[PDB]
Amino acid sequence: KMLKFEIKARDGAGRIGKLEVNGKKIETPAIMPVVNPKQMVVEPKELEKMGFEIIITNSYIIYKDEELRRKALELGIHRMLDYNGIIEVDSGSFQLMKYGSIEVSNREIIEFQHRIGVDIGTFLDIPTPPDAPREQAVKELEITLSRAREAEEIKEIPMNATIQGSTYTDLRRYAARRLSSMNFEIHPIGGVVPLLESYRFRDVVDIVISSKMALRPDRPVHLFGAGHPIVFALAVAMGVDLFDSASYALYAKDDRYMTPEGTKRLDELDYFPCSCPVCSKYTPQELREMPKEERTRLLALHNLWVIKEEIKRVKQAIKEGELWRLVDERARSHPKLYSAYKRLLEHYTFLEEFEPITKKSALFKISNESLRWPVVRRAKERAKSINERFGELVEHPIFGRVSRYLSLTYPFAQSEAEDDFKIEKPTKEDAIKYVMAIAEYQFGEGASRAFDDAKVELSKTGMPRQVKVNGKRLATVRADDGLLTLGIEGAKRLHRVLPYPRMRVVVNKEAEPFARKGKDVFAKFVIFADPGIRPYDEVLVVNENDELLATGQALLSGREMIVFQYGRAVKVRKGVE
Amino acid sequence: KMLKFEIKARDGAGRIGKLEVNGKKIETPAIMPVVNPKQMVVEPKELEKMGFEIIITNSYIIYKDEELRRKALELGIHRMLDYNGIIEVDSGSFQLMKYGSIEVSNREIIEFQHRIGVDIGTFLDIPTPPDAPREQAVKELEITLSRAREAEEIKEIPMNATIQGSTYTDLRRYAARRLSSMNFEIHPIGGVVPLLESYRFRDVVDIVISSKMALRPDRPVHLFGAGHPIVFALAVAMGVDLFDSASYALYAKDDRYMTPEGTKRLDELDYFPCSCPVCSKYTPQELREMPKEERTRLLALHNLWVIKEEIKRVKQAIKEGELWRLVDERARSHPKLYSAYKRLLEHYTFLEEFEPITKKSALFKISNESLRWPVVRRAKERAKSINERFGELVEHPIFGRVSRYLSLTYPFAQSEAEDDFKIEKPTKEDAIKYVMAIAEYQFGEGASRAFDDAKVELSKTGMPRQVKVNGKRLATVRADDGLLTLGIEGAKRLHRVLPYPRMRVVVNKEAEPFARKGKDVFAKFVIFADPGIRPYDEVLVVNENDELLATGQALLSGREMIVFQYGRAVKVRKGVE
């Protein structure tokens, strides 16, 4: 295909990804500034310098304008806007939502998008407003799906296959389920702009998640209209990958000032709570008296900086497994948004499938909501089993009482609350009892049998490290998180002790030789994997005959490993050869 | 009389202020960058251009050095630093904390300070560590106090009188108490560095509060050694006015990067979550390539931009009455900071004493913690009596049940939680019962008796605006808060119905004439005022005989009107004359 997309880092149902469109590579989450064909508040050439590798414009507005049209047909949007990154373009659907009708056929704008050398296109999907009559939502959804099919047969460039269905979650699941079967590269989530403008974030959350539940996990998700910093953290935590903002410009023309926590009127500002190129050298008292053109141009730039800045913040958060903490923080920005944050944590089932097994950061109890974070409810249940068998419970700030044997392990030992948690180191006689517990906790039921007869080496400190058995190393407890890193010799033991498909990732006959030699496993070569597998889990690489080929760490979840056709499914530690 | 301090604005127990010394002005909260006489990562002249109008140095270090000592006496720290702002200077008592004994007398450095042109000095107060034995905390405190007395005598310049009772609330109270009755202009709160470094914010909160309860409200409070953006919001909310940072540079020397939510290691940063002049043009990798010196510079400059920016944000927050929201947001930066926040809300008594009675902003329900904000707690108590009489309860998102009569008054009507609160308009019979309920609420017990024989006129929207009797205007329900604004007649009636000192602001013999007309009352002419008075409450201006002179609105709390010698106390609406 013409669009590649692979996962590089994650946290929550969120992910930092590498997206390649016909040669142009971009890193997501990304926000594409909306540029107006006529009044370009900020020249595309400048957005380019600022670091925006993807922008978006209106095919329709251009199509309907004498000059714009001739220019686009004459030089293509790229030369016309003098921008060289990814130029996405919209169909006019938004105009179709605002005005109820539009003077162009679904076939016409698609053809036109091709004639002007657009990078990514969009067909005339119908944005059913929120709360609209169920009949209308259904009728309009079929016309949408209808045009989708057409677009699928005439498209020669990458395209947006927008998910509609107004406020009915079953319709979103349907729309997403069907569009995912077709050949489209990116999946926007439409019809939410009205909700965003009404601060009805809880509805946006329900709408987004129902769509994410039914979409193929391997295609980018774009949240149409979401162009205000205030939702970036939350949306990304949900799995949104792309945003488009016109607000940075529209607000500027209205002397309105963006902030990661909301918006402020220029006239209500006494100070500039920012340090961007604009705010670091100008004052509100000054801005206020400058020409309207200079005032807009300046607020525009600032708004873009704030946008660029939160996105950067979100990504750095993901890189350190602290996305939830950031969401929690941004949740205090507004009642409605707090409501939405609480709502998002209810979807534990959805969020748990992708929630990493281990993070670089520590579990911070920084609110009541943090007690409902995915990593907490999961660590709780997996624990029940262990505690009842190993007893010797100890007190825990966050979890309450957790066996002293899981106390050196994430998230229990790698967490902090109001009161410091006192880790309980092993004793020469204890050692193994730990590894057994951890094994049982990390690998599931029965997993301890693979280590019973093992000797545990303790470090200069009372810490479990090398887990050996008459000869070589089975595993090793990681200092950074108290979980086990498998040695080929331990993978073998786990492999025989646990029944297939447990911990397994089945690979191509073609991939086989590579695993054996130790190379990492790429998703496209994965034919099947244990559904229970979560990101960063220890994994048993195997062939269709369940023959151990190598052992490593997963980057995707069992299900993703199957769907994905790009990226690495497994980082391999050691191969059998 | 060599240092003025006035409150320009406020929110919570925090306040934006005007601090004038040596004819030099600076606004507060303000953070003074610590300048090491010897090594200087970023030059004072540079710091000044950036915007730091006040800075602090180590006189003792300048003293124990031939080179510096010389240039200091020769040119006075102002030229020796090429800095034309307010130069504060520390005694070296901090070196006394890190080692156990400096080599200079309390008298020696005080005099040296006088001789080098210092704008604000400090005496040799002893910083007892956090959890010291009470005997030591007490021993040292007395020594601190004796040196305090000497400083008071031989003082010739403005000076810092550091509250210093270790972690003993009773000792902090005593110390603050005794230093307030003495002649000093600024009161630092000391010995909390170890606490801060240890992220022990709950402890720092107790110390700061127990101190602010004993200090006289009219003097600047400096929280010694706190130079990390992370405590700013919190600290200012408790009424701290000055900060000093050495960390901006000390951190830059260990490649440590600052954030409003904590600190990060450069070799652990993929992206820069900032748009400052540095992060605006370099990437983390680019910054790691540069030589160790350029690297330190740029980081230090970044840290300073973060510091400067958090301050503008806190000040802008105070200005719009959203300072608690900000604190709540920042409370999610770390478990221990979340702990402090919760503890800070436990001090209702202290906090309530300064929380205004009416804010421009709306009450936001953004967390469990916000239901315990002063404004809420207060409103809940004051209404208990109104519901019990007037009844007509209605379901409210934050207070649960509230008499429909307060439903139009702050902070009930102007709130917002996960859900909206429909405003219950009055009929024409209710008309009065709303004014009565408000009066009983706003002015307290029995105040309603001043508005029985009154008639309430309803404007366009069925809202009660003006109250009259015999035709003359008593008071008028402010539309933006549902709080009554008194008119000379309304006051005359509250004056007789309510027992002295209720609502009274007793003024000077000199000021009596002015208040008679309508001129504003200046805090320095106030001999005594009702302790119950809160910022923006309706107040009755009167003389020692309790004769009504005029009505106005308080800009300080009762307690404050008394101690303050600078600034307005009551914006007089109209006089009796």
Ligand SMILES: N#Cc1c[nH]c2nc(N)[nH]c(=O)c12
């Ligand atoms: N809401 C909303 C939208 C804004 N632009 C859009 N563009 C397309 N194609 N579809 C949509 O739903 C929307």
Ligand SMILES: [Mg+2]
């Ligand atoms: Mg696959």
Ligand SMILES: [Mg+2]
């Ligand atoms: Mg006074």
Ligand SMILES: [Zn+2]
């Ligand atoms: Zn800015």
Ligand SMILES: [Zn+2]
């Ligand atoms: Zn920066």
